[model samples]
Target: MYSMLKRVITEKDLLRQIRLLEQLLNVPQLTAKRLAAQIQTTERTVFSDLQYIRSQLPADWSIETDSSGIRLRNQQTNELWSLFLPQSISIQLLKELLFTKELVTTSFLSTSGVSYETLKRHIKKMNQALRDFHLTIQLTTMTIQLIGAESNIRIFYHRLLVPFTHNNYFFDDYSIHEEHYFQFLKQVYSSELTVETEEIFGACWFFINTIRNKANCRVSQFSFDSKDVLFQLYQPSLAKLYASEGIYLQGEESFFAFFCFLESWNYDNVYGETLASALHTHYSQLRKSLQQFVTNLSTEEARPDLIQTNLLDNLLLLFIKYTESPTLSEQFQLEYQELLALSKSNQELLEILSRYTTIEEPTYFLSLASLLEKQAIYSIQAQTMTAYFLFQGEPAWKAFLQQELAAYLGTRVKLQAIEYVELSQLTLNEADIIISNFPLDLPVFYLSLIPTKNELRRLAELTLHSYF
Candidate 1:
């Protein structure tokens, strides 16, 4: 989602330069061939991007190239790339459309120092990107508008504004307003508003809401009831806060704010009953499907409590939000390649979720996996393997190898150092497995004097299989 938004706001060439700069920052030195391969681009394009990067660097920073490769030297701050990232005309047009009630296309182009054709080209590109959010960039001779569901408009702007939050240009003087609202929410919720949740809520929700309200594009058709206990609890404070700004808080707007809070907070038990009731009443099918999904996830010996009240509560709200506006799902999507590498059970979890919603991406799979994995770990007792290490090496080297293996295997394997002389009297059944520097007649794992990552992985797999 961020990448998509970035492309909308930044030109292709600038975006490529940004990517190259990020690579240079991480590696500091890379040959053109190697950098091109890593970024999946041709060496010619890499050279062009490198030149652009060098041009953007300040006086203290320089890029050097030789047979050894290219190196970024005299680096100052990590965020130097931000200095060169000029917001494109399309983004500027978007900002005007979002905040300006009446905008003249000719006036905008004249002031922006761009031609009409350029503005039209940017508008076309923006409209193409907006399609994902079910939105359109509507332009006319006199005015422009971002046409979409009010809910989707807010969601789109929320995502678009998050990446530039540090600039303060997006929010302007609204920071104080957001700060006050955050404090008010924290007071109402008490300890429920954690640092992480507070950061998420503060990032762009208030700014998005304020801009929408200013444009008179308030969210409507909220499924959750305004009279629910969750809203009732925060109603008085919210009203006073909005009243202080000389605006009356409407029921739908209040509900929208409450919904944003619920989505950002990730659901807590303090409002579990209200949330559950909302789900059962308005989203009955979602609740039923989610229950079955949780049941399907229970594969442990004890049928571990995967629901845990809070997990279901959170999943319910997440599914509700994602199903309403699928563009929001992009914020939580696990990369397709990464999803393919997840455990089979996690893949099954994604498949189960896919049956209900059109969202086939791993939208909430990570959260689900974390909760399921946590419960599974807690419910099942782990089995430890007892292994004897027999190595022909100096005393210090043997001791070091034993220590390394112990640390690598963690609590899964217990290593006992056995000398060569002790092997003569050792029973075959004394240990679960035998680890030796050389091959052994019995079932033994051959280890090098200095173990490699591959060796550690094989040893770990051996212990895992033995547990079954």
Candidate 2:
């Protein structure tokens, strides 16, 4: 194996052709041009390589040539080439069948960093020297080609196989719940399972474990379709059951999609009824709190704006608390202050939040700007942003100003109620902020005038979380 690995045949290794030539029955009889074309290389290489290979063989080894092609026939019969070359050819075929673009994990790559075509070509050449030429190779991907009912989906269950060799199933111990969930989802997806239940703590643990296990094997994909499969199954009655979370997710497409993707195993519960009760009780408190918050706010304030903006904020806060991936800091302010001026910020810019340690400035502004589209104002820089609202200004900062302003506003926010969203789609903890134009009817009082222009002095907070 070391010898095989050590060869490291490079594209420039014209010498590998000697192996190719020897393997073809050492027929050494093919024209340089034909061999080069067949091997996707240059003609000059073949002529030079043939001369090199001739020096290695018995002096009697000679070439028999004619108009058809050049053939090198050995004076002595040596079938060394035939011994291993045939199986190598077969393995190369196997790799093509299981790992090429058509059989890759997901959607076709248009301009993937490494072109699929190039990768395929390399895989093709590498597989040619393998010993286990007949061993079958299969790829199980998170994203499958699904348009309708699949006859085989039930057979494989939800698990994908990457010549998996049971690398996924733990030491002959199959995860009872995961195996069951896959069986259940198969029926639900095929419209054969009609019953609906809710997710609980145990189920959450089980489902999360399943995702975690898959991720351990380099599993990086999950469905990102406009609608997650489970959402269609989240019927009205079920809606009341998962209300708080439902309301929360309804505000974010990526979150909800993932929430659904990860939480779609209610049927896996060993105690389905217990799971239902737990979810209903757990979420009912949140639902009630949301309702009450809505009732307390005013007509002048924007419910849709606050609701959606704050929902994302809450989720992000929770994410920051749990995952090191979403950094919570004050330094993000200066960085975002810069991004708020650009049109787009990609993965690199998003990392700025993690690097920032100070949580002094407004990180929520991006999400708020996203939610407040057209009704507010923002500037995007490097696709990231830092923003202060018309509401958070200082000229109106007199001690009595708080008393004179319009009444404190209504319930915070939601995503479904807000229409026409525009921003980048997310994966894992990745997020972006877009500054939007929220046109609020400014209060004639000094409070409105403070935010009326870009001179909101309260924005220069030297400390933390003190937004006006």
Candidate 3:
């Protein structure tokens, strides 16, 4: 999760302190010794870090020390954690390279209060991180600039500014303009925007576009036809909004904004059918790819129609976004460890997608995989399992156990409560699994008369293994 921020904040100790605070906020309390062990630092250093943390905290918040351990007292909002991090000079330098046109090394050093060597080190690290975005921080004799495709540059800023927006660190206060864009989007999309959606599409997009326009950097390659359905849908209102800010929403700029909408909006309820039809009408290759992708994921245990109906338009929009700008493939790419941990279905989805397009972002694969997983679970639930509950208890207690277990397991399991006395005549072969309150000679999942937490956990694991 902190992968992107690691590039922005290039200091190791500052990152570690952020991690330490994260750990403290997640749990009730921790000893200095335990904190040190977890963060791989000395106990004395942990005490010093804690002292610094307390000094940075707000008036209502503090680090409390007790006989038990150290804990954060009166913790309010998690978003305020960004405030604890001292603004990195590297981030400031990157901002200058982004928003300023003529960047002079000496000028940046003087204004940012960093020495020449320090600025150079930050630039080196920034270049290293920017490589994934196909961006380079080029430093000449006394000038520096961020060089890349205009689309890729915007994507990098989009990635950078989103977290800042979430953490209440606005570079320029665009709240008023953000609202204007939010209302404009509601009018154009013909749907209400969620708060989370508004935050990204409204605030972050507005800021990135406004700054990039001010810097005279614009997307030059991708263009939206004036007659294009999606473009036409957004042009009139959005163009006026851009003009209000002294910026021309040209064909390429309008297309960029439209692409942002495609990537960001959850238009399933409002535009799913419309967009799916649009895909079939305009982009036959993408439509066929979606069909084949769904076909590949179909199985005796999975519902293809449901999967397509639920995710067809979503996948289509995703494909269009990535196909238009392949640079994003690396921008949103997941780490190797994260890719290795994809669920079986998600792994299969990734392989299927590889056959159709160049996009390999695990985020896209996992998102669709989540929807597919839910459908698979529903399909599994539709097929009932027979479980014999072998118990020696009162009738009321037996009925209670059956009810509770059935409720916990959902409609998937058809539980039959069998008394111990009837076991002699019962044919256990018909049962898929056996549930019992005591040890049995045969294989059975044993639960106490009242299930313990561990037993329920084991039972859940067993159920998952059985279905998945």
On lDDT, the candidate that comes out on top is 3
Structural similarity to truth (TM-score) of each candidate: 0.67, 0.19, 0.77
Ranking by lDDT: 3, 1, 2
lDDT per prediction?
Answer: 0.63, 0.32, 0.65
Root-mean-square deviation of every model: 7.0, 23.7, 5.2
lDDT string for model 3 (236-294, tens) is 66676676678887677876765565556553435534554665688776567666656
TM-score of 1: 0.67
Question: Which candidate tops TM-score?
Answer: 3
Ranking by TM-score: 3, 1, 2
Error of 2 at 199 (Å): 16
Question: Worst 10-residue stretch by lDDT in candidate 2?
Answer: 409-418
lDDT of 1 by residue, 244-334 (tens): 5565668788766655654565444355344445556776776777677666666432455555545555566566555543443443232
**Model 3: colliding residue pairs:** none
| Global CA lDDT computed for model 2 | 0.32
